[PDB]
């Protein structure tokens, strides 16, 4: 008796609804096996980790819990609009769209301070920097620059992942001016990561020739790392 | 015509809205209220309260009342509120992993198919919504099976009571038969019943 | 004495304290020193605060909280208790909250052992151990006296 | 005598820096080391001796030391409510065989 | 000051428990999508927006 109005009439209101401004995401795909929602984690290099769809028991709002007993009043005792022979009505695509809109301005503005401040905190787009004076003469911002691994992680690293270009190279005792060149020839960002004894030989010189800030774990003995075979480097 | 409004950044908002849901418990409700309001708006399902259950005569019969009873308690009262909301969640975002208002049954009295039926009727009626909770339920059903199918829910639970999808779809069937707390709805496990595999 | 370095007239003592702290070893501290915070519902559980209290009263405080925390038992398993306690096959649902309601446990080994002795002295004890059941039984209402 | 006397003469003589014999608190009545994983607060290390000599192993009192206290989110002794369902039937309720 | 009365913002609510409030620091976020094992995937073009 019910499918007459139910499949034919409830179905449409549902489809029209599948397109509502806000009801975003994805709910299914008709397949019970296999379909698993897509997960979203707000991850941050600075150690933030708050996933979007987390499971946390019944909330105060009152939605979390699903209750199947609702099937009966719908199935047995609930009169319909097009079942007993009223004239199907139609929502005014206005109230409910202006409304979806109503929430969006209200909603985006609200995350406005919360999002605004963290940025003040992030200290957006800018790596610290210690420039080490090489070749006694030439002074200030005329040597080798290198920044702490944490700075590199945070600000400069996430960007690298997006461009695709293969992650940086490793300042190693062996690597010649060629390896550094080839790596920057790829990532094309001019940053080299250090994690191998002395830098020694040229290349370190090539570094004077090129920004190629070299990133390295915490500062100290950062002159005992390089092989300033002519005293200029100096942890100070 | 070219209205003089600003714009409607599809990206800023898909993501801007993203931060809000991620860290703002209340958004699920704000949204499910539009559809819920909208559905009540389309006058899609008016609700009556002149209670109509069983073929009436059943309520009156001596023997049936045992069943007149299970269904009577299982079934509730048409809340004007619950029915739209019930429909609204069919299509609206999911932000908490719905839990199944655990229905504790024993399945040991033929009149009790009433409950297995609640689900079939329910899954059919709002399946996308039902999908979230296939686990709490797969959870209820094997019990029904342990009851009405000993021989078959012998090999079935054993084949594995939960499975996963291998890099090549081949379902990897776990050999255990642990329960299924929603706690792993977001993991890589699927309740096993619904594997729909022979 | 430390919360008063370069902060007290008395020059000597101050000089040494300001110096005493200079040692490679000793290093004073104060307030919120380390936090671990439940998984699942990402809020912050037990905070380790370096408040200055003796060293003894303090260490023992950890004896209780530490044990409380060690016993991975929560307030959820509790339903298991009244679980056995009620018309064998009753049903207890939810709500269950992870490690946001840790509960000591239930020292099983102490009681029968402590309890054995309890009854050994006051033998009148059986009067109660039975008192309760009688109350429970008349309560489940399984037999009502009458003049029929 | 005087064993509880850990600090003596808090005044400053004018001539001679250290007044005639004055104690001045030992580097313990303020060493607030860490808090072992096991829960035994132990004095700050000593150039990598790692283990800080558990505060309770030696015999020096030590005002100040980490205390792990539980926050506002871990109320305990909470009277928690549950829904109990009395199995319907009775005649059904099985007792025997496991 | 903005006039957008904020409540239960950033917090939680779940009846039964308290309304324990998460943190809010966040620095820079990436709405990266997490492999099932609950651990951040390296943003891929042909799978996520």
């Amino acid at each position: 008796n019910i499918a007459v109005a139910h499949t034919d009439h409830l179905s449409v209101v549902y489809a029209t609804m599948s397109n509502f401004m806000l009801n975003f995401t994805n709910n299914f795909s008709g397949n019970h096996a296999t379909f698993k929602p897509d997960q979203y984690v707000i991850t941050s290099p600075e150690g933030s980790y708050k996933p979007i769809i987390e499971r946390q028991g019944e909330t105060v709002d009152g939605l979390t819990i699903i209750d199947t007993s609702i099937v009966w009043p719908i199935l047995c005792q609930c009169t319909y609009p097009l079942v007993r022979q009223e004239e199907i009505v139609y929502p005014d695509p206005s109230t409910t769209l202006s409304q979806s809109l109503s929430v969006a301005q209200v909603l985006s503005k609200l995350t406005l301070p919360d999002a605004f401040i963290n940025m003040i905190l992030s200290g957006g787009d800018s790596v610290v920097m210690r420039t080490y004076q090489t070749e006694a003469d030439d002074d200030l911002d005329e040597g080798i620059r290198m920044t702490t691994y944490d700075q590199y992680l945070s600000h400069i690293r996430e960007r690298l992942h997006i461009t695709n270009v293969p992650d940086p190279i490793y300042i190693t005792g062996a690597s010649t001016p060629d390896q550094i060149a080839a790596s920057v020839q790829a990532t094309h960002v001019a940053v080299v990561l250090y994690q191998s004894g002395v830098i020694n030989g040229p290349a370190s010189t090539y570094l004077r020739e090129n920004e190629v800030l070299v990133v390295m774990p915490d500062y100290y003995d950062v002159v005992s790392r390089f092989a300033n075979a002519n005293l200029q480097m100096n942890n100070n | 015509a070219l209205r003089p409004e600003l714009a409607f950044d599809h990206d800023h908002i898909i993501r801007c809205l993203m931060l809000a849901a991620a860290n703002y418990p209340r958004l699920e409700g704000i949204i499910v209220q539009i559809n819920t309001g909208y559905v009540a708006s389309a006058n899609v399902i008016r609700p009556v309260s002149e209670k109509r259950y069983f073929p009436e005569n059943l309520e009156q019969n001596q023997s049936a009342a045992r069943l007149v009873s299970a269904v009577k308690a299982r079934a509730s009262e048409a809340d004007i509120s619950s029915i739209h909301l019930a429909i609204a969640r069919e299509v609206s975002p999911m932000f908490n992993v719905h839990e199944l208002k655990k229905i504790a049954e024993s399945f040991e009295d033929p009149s009790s198919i009433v409950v297995v039926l609640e689900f079939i009727l329910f899954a059919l009626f709002f399946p996308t919504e039902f999908n979230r909770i296939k686990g709490d339920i797969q959870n209820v059903l094997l019990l029904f099976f342990s009851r009405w199918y000993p021989v078959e829910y012998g090999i079935f639970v054993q084949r594995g009571a939960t499975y996963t999808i291998n890099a090549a779809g081949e379902f990897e069937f776990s050999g255990r038969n642990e329960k299924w707390d929603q706690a792993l709805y977001l993991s890589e496990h699927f309740p096993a019943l619904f594997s729909d595999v022979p | 004495p430390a919360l008063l370095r370069d902060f007290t007239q008395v020059n000597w003592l101050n000089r040494d304290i300001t110096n005493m702290l200079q040692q490679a070893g000793t290093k004073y501290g104060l307030g919120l020193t380390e936090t671990r915070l439940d998984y699942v519902r990402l809020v912050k559980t037990i905070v380790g605060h370096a408040l200055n209290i003796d060293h003894f009263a303090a260490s023992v405080l950890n004896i209780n909280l530490r044990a409380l925390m060690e016993a991975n038992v929560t307030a959820d398993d509790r339903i298991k208790a009244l679980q056995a306690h009620s018309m064998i096959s009753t049903q207890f649902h939810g709500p269950n909250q992870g490690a946001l309601r840790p509960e000591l446990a239930f020292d099983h080994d102490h009681i029968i052992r402590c309890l054995m002795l309890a009854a050994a002295n006051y033998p009148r004890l059986e009067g109660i151990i039975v008192q309760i059941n009688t109350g429970y039984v008349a309560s489940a209402n399984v037999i009502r006296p009458v003049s029929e | 005598i005087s064993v509880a006397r850990s600090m003596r003469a808090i005044v400053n003589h004018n001539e001679v820096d250290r007044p005639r014999g004055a104690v001045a608190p030992s580097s313990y009545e303020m060493d607030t080391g860490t808090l072992s994983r096991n829960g035994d607060l132990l004095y700050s290390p000593v150039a990598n001796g790692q283990v800080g000599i558990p505060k309770l192993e030696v015999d020096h009192i030590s005002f100040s030391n980490v205390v792990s206290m539980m926050t506002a989110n871990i109320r305990t002794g909470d009277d928690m409510a549950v829904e109990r369902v009395n199995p319907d039937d009775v005649r059904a309720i099985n007792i025997r065989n496991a | 000051i903005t006039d957008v009365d904020s409540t239960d913002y950033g917090k939680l609510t779940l009846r039964f428990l308290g309304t324990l409030t998460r943190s809010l620091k966040m620095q820079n976020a990436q709405i990266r999508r997490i492999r099932p094992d609950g651990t951040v995937l390296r943003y891929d073009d042909q799978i996520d927006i």
Partner: peptide, 15 residues
């Protein structure tokens, strides 16, 4: 009997 969400909660358990 009635449509309600969440635990029907009817007992209080003593620590």
């Amino acid at each position: 009997k009635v449509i309600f969400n969440g635990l029907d909660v009817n007992t209080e358990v003593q620590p």
